[PDB]
Amino acid sequence: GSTFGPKDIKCEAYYMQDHVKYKANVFDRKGDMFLVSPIMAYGSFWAPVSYFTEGNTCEGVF
């Protein structure tokens, strides 16, 4: 349970929907696909974080 501290986060990427940009927290990777979570702790799904070329916080997976 950490917000200021990428402990439970490690990677937090962004994405905009042509105008609205928000965060997506990312944990690990699987090939060219990454392993992300929604705006809560509920499951985990793969998403191309490679598309989140705005700014992300993943340093330990990099």
Cα–Cα dist 47/51, whole Å:
9
Half-sphere exposure of 36 (CA within 13 A, CB side): 23
Backbone angles phi, psi at 34, to 5 degrees: -110, 170
What is the DSSP annotation of 29-62?
EETTEEEEE-SSSS--EEE-GGG-TT-----TT-
56 contacts 14 by C-beta, under 8 angstroms: yes
13 contacts 19 by C-beta, under 8 angstroms: no
Provide the residue type at 55 as one letter.
G
27 contacts 11 by C-beta, under 8 angstroms: yes
Q: Which of 21, 22, 49 is nearest to 35 (CA)?
A: 49
Angle at alpha carbon of residue 51, lines to 47 and 56, rounded to 5°: 90
